[PDB]
Design a protein around this ligand. Structure first.
Ligand SMILES: *CC(=O)CC[C@@H](C)[C@H]1CC[C@H]2[C@@H]3CC[C@@H]4C[C@H](OS(=O)(=O)O)CC[C@]4(C)[C@H]3CC[C@]12C
Ligand SMILES: *CC(=O)CC[C@@H](C)[C@H]1CC[C@H]2[C@@H]3CC[C@@H]4C[C@H](OS(=O)(=O)O)CC[C@]4(C)[C@H]3CC[C@]12C
Ligand SMILES: *CC(=O)CC[C@@H](C)[C@H]1CC[C@H]2[C@@H]3CC[C@@H]4C[C@H](OS(=O)(=O)O)CC[C@]4(C)[C@H]3CC[C@]12C
Ligand SMILES: *CC(=O)CC[C@@H](C)[C@H]1CC[C@H]2[C@@H]3CC[C@@H]4C[C@H](OS(=O)(=O)O)CC[C@]4(C)[C@H]3CC[C@]12C
Lengths: 315, 316, 316, 316
């Protein structure tokens, strides 16, 4: 998986993720309105009037299990695989806000309006792993971003690390610190035209565009996707309207797309970008296309009764 | 730019290309019906009953100028920029089928039904580059394929090279032989899960998928795009239906897409995949999507009066 | 700078060190005899009868400042630059064995006989940085190895980290955990001849040796050097005698040599492997050659009065 | 293998090569004096007063068969493996200078005084490959240099190609124009300290020296060795004395040395830099070290009877 965040001229949020896996989970566009009554698993605090929330996920035990979601105030969050590094406790800790791992995305989007608020509240949060019936435990880290910045939440054996995501991007293993250090190997690549030069008597000129970008890895592994999508996201010209920014989002995530036949998993099946999701705070709209249908479908917040009380799943 | 070709179990053609440029020429889905009368520039002959042709291009001086086109019999062709390597004569040659460079895609699609036919008649073809004063000359090489195989036509100062394209893939500079030699650098790359191993006492395991693919370049230069798209086309599992094959073709071309901001051209503007076209001989249908809209449109030959005599265009 | 350790089939120590810098500091072969009296700066406790020690370094205030050194029992230690990550305290700690950073190599070699002994007492060692007012601060990390295994000592702000160096290799920045994670990118390279394979119809064969090794970086940066020399150390065939093992040591280190003109440092000067030092516990001998003289020169412990009381600096 | 040429401020020749193989042929330093009489296999003419020649090679049928050699006027030549591309006729051609492949280095060194002269004569030269029934036929290309420039001689099925070697460097397969095209992939690497930049809000800096060099491949394949040694040869600062330039010649070739264990060849054995030989026109001296002894041995032309009439050889 790959998560991307960027802003426009007016401070709006643009946020999206690739879902790379070998099979579908039957996920769907999921709307949890403000009047929906939710009881947190470990009695975690919340807001009196919660926020409207839309995203992609599944429903289990009448609870919205969000793969990624956003609220009506420009805050969004996604969950990405982190096994071999993620480590959670299975028992609540008193004195802290105990949140189940599956409910962390819904909890963030419902009770907070900014990355600033999330960062301070996390200073007293215990992420507790409670096994869900029939599914092996998920070992994830989270990518949270608003209109100004993004953070990475990596709960590991030695505690919880909250990183300032200066590249506004995230993938999978290994640690976020490794990925930021790894970027320094590629610090000389450029999107400019390769300047003509000579090695001794040999004159060197580029055939055309892209030679200055040589060095960027092309494989679909987690560290290489991080470098590729960080370069793409950092060099994309800033856009100023909804359609162009949504186009920027899906094209940036498309730069690290996983095509059928590229890479097998431990199971022996090919991992592929099953769907690409996205959110815009300028219009409070969720966007999505799939591997079999690249046409971007839109799901606005303003055409669902956000005061209703039941979960809405749009096929 | 990048050309891609593959087939299904039934032997149907699947052909497409990315167009990566900094601006648009106003190109458009263009239909050349059988009844449209065309006069070759230097009198090259062809079918008395030409084939129906659909593709993407422009109309100049009432002539259809195709960027890439296909016919009703499963033969397709694409023109890709080849400056610094492409070289043509400026005057025709007596005794040979002299074809202008801009009319080469149309002339191939109208008069030939297979790649074997094109390769045979190319042994007596002279590609003439007509000199237009107030415009630079188009310096292209071509990617021609049907249901069975593809070939690369690279006309250079030392003659016309017709290559058997075993990777079913083409980009830009340099010569095709360079690209085929360059793939040998990456012959150890694999799409399998990286097998655990040891360096001395240190056990090495992959974080997950993709580590066996390590070594493939990710830049948008012409040589790196050749390797990445040849890897993807060769390792893509064979598909059974039209929807899966059309989705395979666009996803294959999407692996070497040029995103805004990645690379500037000599004149300062970024190079982007403005559009991606496709063709399927199973339904004789052209496909296309754009940088501003990823939805794949379809344009079947069955939806146009192929017996008419006027070029049909559908703008964007 | 690169450090390399390996062992023969008899359990002997082979320890090597590249010193990559832009100028020399006057270092020579420096012998510290068993009868030489030395007072630890912060009163750290050592052996009653110290070990004989030989290595490369300078003499400051009649104190052996060792770049790298080994003892008569097969234990060796090398200091390599670690600025930007190395952070020490400036005052001693009560109840701990406080060791100054500049004396850590001499302290390790004189008082210990294996990496097990070193790793054990390191759980109570505090490395202190005594800043000379006119000089800048020395910020190093250390590579310690014997005949069985090696460890890496990286003292940082969040404490002292002691790593089990399973690749028996150390370079420079960043932390050792990064380098070991980084190796997982290259786990698919191979010293075997690349097996012929096919991409679609394209048959791919290697021109010759080395194609299975494609992927290994070739630049002289710190992470790229770690990857390249860890690959070479892990794939070097085992040697039985001494001359071949000393040859293995200098060829492995030579795989990541810094040639003049390859890379400029901050001051605009070029960085070069000024000398390459080595040690063999089978013969208790130090070896060394320089950028200007590739001939390896030996300095045997049995050639010096190890019972004397004066530092012996060997010139020429 | 790898060939390398460069010069100093006074225009002297500095020429050398690595020998990478799985075994040795018993070759030695080999002096061919002027008085030695040589009857060319196919009647190729030459000077009345031949030049004195020295190099590394073997003696077969009282003929000196050099791996690499140089004459007293500063002209050198080496032969490097080229199977799969090298193709020779097996019969002489009337009207030309028919030179056998094994006598090509000696013929060039004994009869010509500059690269300019060899270039002019090669226009009427036929490279004839005379095969023996026991051994396999040698398929090589040649690296010829002097105090000014170097050229590459690649005899192939479609004729003989003589390239101007702008990088003054040669390795093995594929063709020379592939390697010169391939260098363009790396045109952005630099020996300068990487300049601090930013990706968005993230500030990127180099750990130290060598990050600007990131991109150069580190494997021992023929294409990767070409890129890495061309880079190293091109950025080495010029030197103006014999000792500094012999050091440069061996350090530059050492940047593409084959270390034991890096890569197996077709028959399962590891390939290694068995010896590294060099030549200097300033002193008319041949140099040589080996995998086992890095000490550089010198063999001056003025230490042999260049007026004698029999081959002189230096055992081991
Ligand atoms: C992006 C990745 O590579 C991550 C793997 C992918 C299969 C994940 C992404 C989101 C997950 C779901 C999130 C919602 C719940 C969480 C539950 O976690 S648990 O409580 O620890 O068991 C498990 C079920 C489910 C539906 C996750 C399934 C796996 C994911 C789709
Ligand atoms: C990604 C690439 O390789 C770039 C290719 C692009 C610049 C080319 C490909 C097809 C060309 C057009 C072909 C039709 C006509 C031909 C005219 O040349 S002429 O023969 O002198 O008349 C020039 C105009 C046009 C529309 C070409 C323009 C360049 C291309 C779009
Ligand atoms: C290739 C590299 O990583 C560069 C390392 C190089 C700069 C270091 C390595 C060993 C150092 C010497 C160690 C011995 C003493 C320690 C003294 O510490 S201080 O007195 O507290 O400053 C400084 C001098 C000296 C000789 C070190 C000099 C630098 C090194 C050669
Ligand atoms: C690293 C390399 O590319 C070196 C390749 C190596 C195997 C070659 C290079 C020089 C060759 C020798 C040249 C002298 C003679 C030539 C004879 O030619 S033949 O008679 O036509 O067969 C063969 C023997 C010998 C000694 C060559 C052997 C192969 C090489 C050492």
């Amino acid at each position: 998986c790959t998560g991307v965040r960027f802003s426009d001229d007016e401070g709006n949020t643009y946020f999206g993720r690739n879902l790379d896996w070998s099979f579908s989970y039957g996920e769907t566009i999921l709307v949890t309105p403000r009047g929906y009554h939710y009881d947190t698993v470990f009695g975690a605090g919340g807001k009196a009037k919660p926020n409207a929330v839309i995203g992609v996920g599944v429903v289990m035990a009448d609870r919205p299990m969000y793969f990624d979601c956003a609220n009506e105030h420009g805050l969004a969050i996604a969950g990405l695989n982190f096994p071999g590094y993620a480590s959670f406790v299975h028992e609540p800790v008193e004195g802290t806000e105990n949140v189940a791992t599956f409910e962390f995305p819904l909890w963030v989007a419902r009770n907070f309006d900014s990355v600033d608020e999330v960062e301070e509240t996390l200073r007293n949060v215990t992420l507790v792993s409670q096994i869900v019936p029939g599914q092996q435990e998920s070992l994830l880290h989270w990518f949270i971003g608003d209109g100004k910045r993004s953070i990475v939440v990596e709960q590991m054996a030695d505690g919880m690390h909250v990183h300032h995501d200066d590249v506004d991007v995230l993938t999978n293993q290994p640690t976020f610190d490794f990925h930021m250090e790894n970027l320094r190997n590629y610090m000389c690549v450029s999107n400019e035209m390769a300047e003509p030069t000579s090695w001794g008597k040999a004159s060197l000129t580029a055939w055309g565009a892209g030679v200055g970008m040589h060095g960027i890895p092309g494989d679909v592994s987690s560290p290489s996707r991080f470098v590729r999508v960080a370069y793409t996201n950092a060099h994309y010209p800033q856009q100023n309207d909804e359609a162009a920014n949504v186009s920027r989002l899906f094209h940036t995530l498309g730069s690290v797309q996983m095509v059928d036949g590229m890479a097998k998993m431990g199971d022996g099946q090919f991992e592929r970008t099953l769907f690409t999701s996205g959110y815009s705070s300028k219009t409070n709209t969720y966007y999505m296309n799939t591997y079999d249908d690249p046409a971007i479908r839109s799901y606005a917040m303003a055409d669902y009764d956000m005061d209703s009380s039941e979960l809405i799943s749009v096929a």
